Design an enzyme around this catalytic site. Structure first.
Site, PDB file in Angstrom:
ATOM      1  N   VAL A  26      99.796 -31.921  27.734  1.00 20.15           N
ATOM      2  CA  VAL A  26     100.140 -31.561  29.555  1.00 20.15           C
ATOM      3  C   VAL A  26      98.241 -31.698  29.751  1.00 20.15           C
ATOM      4  CG1 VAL A  26     100.904 -31.317  31.064  1.00 20.15           C
ATOM      5  CG2 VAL A  26     102.319 -31.497  29.293  1.00 20.15           C
ATOM      6  N   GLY A  27      97.772 -30.823  29.293  1.00 17.85           N
ATOM      7  CA  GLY A  27      96.314 -30.426  30.039  1.00 17.85           C
ATOM      8  C   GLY A  27      95.679 -29.182  29.482  1.00 17.85           C
ATOM      9  N   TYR A  28      90.010 -23.246  31.501  1.00 17.22           N
ATOM     10  CA  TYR A  28      90.211 -21.745  31.396  1.00 17.22           C
ATOM     11  C   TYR A  28      91.709 -22.065  29.790  1.00 17.22           C
ATOM     12  N   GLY A  29      91.811 -21.946  29.674  1.00 13.68           N
ATOM     13  CA  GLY A  29      93.265 -22.669  28.974  1.00 13.68           C
ATOM     14  C   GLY A  29      93.816 -24.075  28.272  1.00 13.68           C
ATOM     15  N   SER A  30      94.478 -24.486  27.871  1.00 10.16           N
ATOM     16  CA  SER A  30      95.034 -25.331  27.452  1.00 10.16           C
ATOM     17  C   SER A  30      96.136 -25.010  27.926  1.00 10.16           C
ATOM     18  CB  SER A  30      94.995 -25.941  25.668  1.00 10.16           C
ATOM     19  OG  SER A  30      93.713 -26.355  25.495  1.00 10.16           O
ATOM     20  N   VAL A  31      97.129 -26.247  28.233  1.00  4.27           N
ATOM     21  CA  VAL A  31      98.797 -26.492  28.567  1.00  4.27           C
ATOM     22  C   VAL A  31      99.745 -26.542  27.480  1.00  4.27           C
ATOM     23  CG1 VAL A  31     100.515 -26.176  30.609  1.00  4.27           C
ATOM     24  CG2 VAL A  31      98.257 -25.167  30.819  1.00  4.27           C
ATOM     25  N   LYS A  46     100.599 -22.307  28.641  1.00  2.00           N
ATOM     26  CA  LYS A  46      99.435 -21.627  28.396  1.00  2.00           C
ATOM     27  C   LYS A  46      98.432 -20.832  27.620  1.00  2.00           C
ATOM     28  CE  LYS A  46      97.052 -19.934  32.164  1.00  2.00           C
ATOM     29  NZ  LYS A  46      96.450 -20.120  33.707  1.00  2.00           N
ATOM     30  N   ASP A 159      98.654 -21.170  41.606  1.00  2.00           N
ATOM     31  CA  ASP A 159      96.906 -21.445  41.462  1.00  2.00           C
ATOM     32  C   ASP A 159      96.474 -20.718  42.090  1.00  2.00           C
ATOM     33  OD1 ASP A 159      97.407 -22.975  38.596  1.00  2.00           O
ATOM     34  OD2 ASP A 159      96.465 -24.879  40.156  1.00  2.00           O
TER      35      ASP A 159
HETATM   36 MG    MG Z   1      95.496 -26.544  40.791  1.00  2.00          MG
END
Ligand code: MG
Ligand code: A7K
Ligand code: A7K
Ligand code: CL
Ligand code: CL
Ligand code: CL
Ligand code: CL
Ligand code: CL
Ligand code: CL
Length: 341
Positions: A26-27, A28-31, A46, A159
């Site tokens: 889908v998209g 500091y980390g990978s998701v 994540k 967030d």
């Molecule tokens: Mg955000």
């Protein structure tokens, strides 16, 4: 311990419990998005990137896990699961966080909004903030892209601020919602910075336009001071930098504007609330608890259904530890996680 399975998706190895199926990047980390067969929800998984590479990064990983484990409120994102494929502290390297999959944010709506929609959306932000602030937590990064909204107009804050110099430079939404005392480092800030952000968001819902879209820090300050007025001697005493005080005093003085002539045709009670949020001196801004009792929310306010948080211990923030000590503390928090009902 569940059974894990491994797979490579878009250049990264994912090793996750069997309950999580049909992973899709889908998209500091990978998701990845996934279907959680244990709960029936669609979820975001994540994988943290290099969580223990430095002391600063190890401490930031611990900070995020402690905060997400604490947040248990209808208008705040919560933690559904956290896991590692490691069987021992000795082989512990990777951290995975699981939350509810969010669709639209406030941008994907900011549609045709009635005053009743603005009442309900801002009520929910303040209800979540009363809870967050009761734990002495400051969000620090409230803006429309950090607010999830569903079809029923139900809202969640996400967030949390756990940002760099380049990210805040120029014509960027990352700075348009920030209180001026933190944008220019005037003083030690506190939870009142979040109420400034709510004011900017509420004005944008009512007008369809960004309130303070500055092209840089200084342009943005000029837009702010034209609306709320230049500071008086009382606030000037509270600004620590002599240079910042000197710069303020180089500006010609301006009175506060008439907000009814800015927000033309808005509900007079919405205008009154905006005047109490968008106050330059942070000591004098309305708090989240006070704003919930304002007459603009009479339709939704229920003081028996606006809960506060359990106490939250942040003593770790002043602690000086080694990488492997921050890593062991994080490991403990992963293995002690208890899922929600
Ligand atoms: Mg955000
Ligand atoms: N669509 C905009 C809108 C909706 C409702 C109330 C006021 C406004 N504008 C806000 C900016 C104003 C310029 O200072 C002009 C009017
Ligand atoms: N950026 C324009 C805008 C959009 C929506 C509502 C009010 C406003 N102005 C905000 C800046 C004010 C002076 O700085 C004048 C009014
Ligand atoms: Cl499983
Ligand atoms: Cl949630
Ligand atoms: Cl691992
Ligand atoms: Cl945004
Ligand atoms: Cl002057
Ligand atoms: Cl705690």
């Amino acid at each position: 311990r569940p059974t894990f399975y491994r797979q490579e998706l878009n250049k990264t190895i994912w090793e996750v419990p069997e309950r999580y199926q049909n992973l899709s990047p889908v998209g500091y980390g990978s998701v990845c998005a996934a279907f959680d067969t244990k709960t029936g929800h669609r979820v975001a998984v994540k994988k943290l990137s290099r969580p223990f590479q430095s002391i600063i990064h190890a401490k930031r990983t611990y900070r995020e896990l402690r905060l997400l484990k604490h947040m248990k409120h209808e208008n705040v994102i919560g933690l559904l699961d956290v896991f590692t494929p490691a069987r021992s502290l000795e082989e512990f390297n990777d951290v995975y966080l699981v939350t509810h999959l969010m669709g639209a944010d406030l941008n994907n709506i900011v549609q045709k909004l009635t005053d009743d929609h603005v009442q309900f959306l801002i009520y929910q932000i303040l209800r979540g903030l009363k809870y967050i602030h009761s734990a002495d937590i400051i969000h620090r990064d409230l803006k429309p892209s950090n607010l999830a909204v569903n079809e029923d107009c139900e809202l969640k804050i996400l967030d949390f601020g756990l940002h760099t110099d380049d990210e805040m430079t120029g014509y960027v939404a990352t700075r348009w919602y920030r209180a001026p005392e933190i944008m220019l480092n005037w003083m030690h800030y506190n939870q009142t910075v979040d109420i400034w952000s709510v004011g900017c968001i509420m004005a944008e819902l009512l007008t369809g336009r960004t309130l303070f879209p500055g092209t840089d820090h200084i342009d943005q300050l000029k837009l702010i001071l034209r609306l709320v007025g230049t500071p008086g001697a009382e606030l000037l005493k509270k600004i620590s930098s002599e240079s910042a005080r000197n710069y303020i005093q180089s500006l010609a003085q301006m009175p506060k504007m008439n907000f009814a002539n800015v927000f033309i045709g808005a509900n007079p009670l919405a205008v009154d609330l905006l005047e109490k949020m968008l106050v330059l001196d942070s000591d004098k801004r309305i708090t989240a608890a006070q704003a919930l009792a304002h007459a603009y929310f009479a339709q939704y306010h229920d003081p028996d259904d606006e809960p506060v948080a359990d106490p939250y211990d942040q003593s770790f923030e002043s602690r000086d530890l080694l990488i492997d000590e921050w890593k062991s503390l994080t490991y403990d928090e992963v293995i002690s996680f208890v899922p929600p009902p």
